[model samples]
Target: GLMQFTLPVRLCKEIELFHFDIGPFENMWPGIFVYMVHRSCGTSCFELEKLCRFIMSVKKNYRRVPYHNWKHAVTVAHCMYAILQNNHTLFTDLERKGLLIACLCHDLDHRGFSNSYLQKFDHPLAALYSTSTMEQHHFSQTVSILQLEGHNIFSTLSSSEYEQVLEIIRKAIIATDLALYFGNRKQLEEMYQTGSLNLNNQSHRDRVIGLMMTACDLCSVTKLWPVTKLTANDIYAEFWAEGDEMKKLGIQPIPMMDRDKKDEVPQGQLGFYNAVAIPCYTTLTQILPPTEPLLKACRDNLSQWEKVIRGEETATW
Candidate 1:
């Protein structure tokens, strides 16, 4: 079970306890999670709850949808929580809120296919912003919608108070563009090695938040067997759904999203270990030896997958 090596609950409690010293936020957390805590006991606060609802609503409302349903959104949010739980010390208060909220909101309006499709057709999202600027737009939109009087999760914040929250959320959410994935991963590895990072700069803080959010987003292999299987299948289903849409539109199907029986899952995410997820996670955990087990788990999943793809082993459940 994934719970076998759960991060200590004490760690998340520490983060949850680290409230905004300001007045309204200090009292408003219970109102946000009153519904959520009854369902589960993780510290996903108001910003995260709103972000999850926003992303889920976008998928459900679309006539043609991408594969990212509530299932995937919840899965990634849990991953971010786990990552933060394990690396609790590395996160500043702003960093903690930003990281969790970004995981829930980063792909808020994703349409399954890559940015290419959105850009090529001049989708309203793409036309309103530069092809390179989708992350900024997505981050800004989440802030804009939620700041209204009744719906505002941070209902207590004044304009200045709200900007404080928005600035952190914006830096973290826009970081999931995937185009920035590599540089962010590399710097995180350096931090892991040096045991120090210069996040005092706003740009540096944004980069770290982005790196951690991406790490959580791609963390399938580190998860327990059953949840990982569920995520993998959901991704495949989304791919197939998108592929079918492409075919009807007379457009070529993208590989992972393709539903043709011939299309195989992109089983290469194992490279995420040393190349991406782990290096970032190691930095977050401050190179703690505890994270090594999860790293190995990720690698083992990769090797197991390679054997299965080569027909040397049966496919997993």
Candidate 2:
């Protein structure tokens, strides 16, 4: 009986470590948060241990998916962190902290499938959040984690001060849901065209934050070709896996998700670049001139996708 129990115990350890990816994988991601915060905001606002505990739990809760995992979470946060580094004055100090934390926990507990899949499968989360299903799930999960002992990084703030930041975070997390981005983008575009998009206005600041959420979420597509390639492949890998699942259920996936139609990826990327990335970056660059490089990167990636569609870059593919 003891021997059998020992065997199960060992099996449990293996499963846990496998989920933990107990290696150099996501192990170093928490350091990105620690380093950024300590270097900028310092430990006085948040004890180093408390921040560490909070980030460790954030990292722990992320699933080991190909995309929307810890790396993507940290990368989105990194994009926001870098943006704030250059333009911290655009947001109040509390707002900056809220955005950073929101980015880190934005995709917490993502199931490596789209929200449509959840609704299509009639998942409970669909019933819970009729709109922004995973996005709402993420924010609710973020609050629970913050309530954990020693995990509240904003513990030093007063009751009202803390409430303000938490509200910023809730909105920030929900804003990343892609569904609202086009609507927000159109609103911001009109504001800019009319020259009323001043940060001094509360409504303008909210719209800017909404755009920034998507900018950070889709920032990988603006990286260097090699860097973008890796992220794209990771994304496609997750998409194809979901497609495989759909096939098993006798459902045919869209061309973008279907593994058999891998060649159509260039067309898909082109559509994405033309439809979403270019417009977002173009409008953002008009408002934040310092972010011109990100806009430039999107154009560069767009050119590469064009070549791929024309068979010029087939060798690399």
Candidate 3:
């Protein structure tokens, strides 16, 4: 394994704690918000921390380490909080409530690659579900946990409480699909053009929160310097791991790691930063300065990984 499993549970917990009106629990929010959401339905602050850790634990333990992983979950959670802090006015209390909750639970049990890959292999989860609804299975499995007899999380709600929880969860989960980013971005841009806002522009709150969640999900370009480097490394390792699996399955996957010495797409820390990731993220950060720190971090990683990519940095241990 190129990486070790360390819980950045603290990072996520810290972000979640900072967002809500509640206190902390082992720096986690699961028990706290689980109890709260049960008591008040969707009205209470979400335990984004607990919610994320649950997802994180799954990522940490999953055998194949699919397309989605703990790092992506934590990144989305942290970025969502950052975006929320900056533009809370654009969301409604309900939307605000929904965004945080959705971001954490969106990719609970991902299988590394996209749904297309699953279909190719006749994956059991694919057949068990149905007709091209790739992530819907994941979404459904997560939803079931709330209502499953012994595993109910939302059972604490009243009739009205239950209804609201259902509504909020549905909307937020649907929003997590990456394909929706373009549409969500356009909606926010439209709102920005139209100054018609609320007491503080609450009308566009949900839309903005959705935008924020989606943006943060892809906000690698806007992270702090060190975090930017750490995140970049995490993604590179995941991609390389996937490439290896693809080769094992007799499938030709994108050559992201060391597949070709002469024609390798790119390799190591800096190579990935420059050849693939930076270009993608630069487009994002250019839209806002909030992303500058992360962009700079990517720039900083170039030299370190360039050496490794060029065979300068070698494993010492």
Candidate 4:
């Protein structure tokens, strides 16, 4: 049996108020995640205990990698928690519940490698799903865990409600692929610019929530500079390791993945912020005005990266 777990007071204090000041709380995150899901999704006391046990199981499933481990899972889940805390009324009951659960489960069982690498090597996962390979596996893994005895926290829901929640979870998890992020961002931008977006319209609202998943998935960009830089380092460590493996197999890795281009981290991040993250945050804020702060935070991080690229010593790292 899992030990009794409760959300840490400090973590609750930060998430309940929609503050972004929360940092690494690796050991405490499973409890925090359990508390937030139970409250936000309306679980029974029995369901809450089952959820805690399940979360510990999920935590164990994550690989001991540099970036895509349980710590990053909690970090992203906390991001969704903050967004929901601030804009809870905006999303429907199902959307809010699915978003939080999806964020926590999105990177489960990650192999510290990218989809491109998987495809290039004809990795078994790449063969399993023709597109959005990693995402499909993540979602599948999520279902597998839910099937575990005593872990079906959603069992209390009516059958129809259970179906709806699983469908939403599937879409939200698949939407985290960066390749899909660009297309989703553009669709939202067009809807916003043409004045066709309507929260009252279920489709329009779901699309926006889909983009919200991307924003929360990349939440480190809008975090404090130290936090952002530290996350970047961890992710690159995973990328470089993949590059190292590819070289051992006599295959060339992508530029960003190459350890030799380690120095390119700061410069490339600057480009990514301007090209991808800024537009993402901008579009997100247009849909949900309260999210304007995220845009400002990304811009602030961009300025710091600019200084790093210019050789003007900055404490970004």
Q: Give the winner by lDDT.
A: 4
lDDT of 2 by residue, 4-56 (tens): 11223443343211011212446556664665554345445567678788888
> Worst ten-residue run, lDDT, model 1?
17-26
TM-score of every model? 0.69, 0.89, 0.59, 0.91
The candidate that wins on TM-score is 4
Query: What lDDT tens digits, residue by residue, belong to model 3 across residues 69-137?
Result: 544554465555555454435345554555555665667667666665666677887787554344576
In terms of lDDT, which candidate is stronger, 1 or 3?
Answer: 1
> CA lDDT of each candidate?
0.54, 0.79, 0.50, 0.80
Q: Taking the tens digit of each residue's C-alpha lDDT, what string does model 1 give over 1-317?
A: 11111223543343232110112232233233222222233343344455445444433432234245334444455555655655657666555554555555566655565565666555677777775455766666566556544446555446765677677777666666777777776776676577666666666666766766665566666665544555667666666765776776778875655656532553534443446655655564553434454565565666665676778765442
Residues 262-291 of candidate 4: C-alpha lDDT, one tens digit per residue: 677887887799889999989888777887
Per-residue lDDT for 307 in model 1? 70
In model 3, where is the ten-residue run with the lowest total lDDT?
17-26
- TM-score, predicted candidate 3 vs. hidden true structure: 0.59
Among residues 3 or more apart in sequence or in different chains, the pairs in candidate 2 whose N, CA or C atoms overlap within 3 Å are: none
In model 4, which regions exceed 4 Å deviation?
1-12, 16-25, 42-46, 314-317
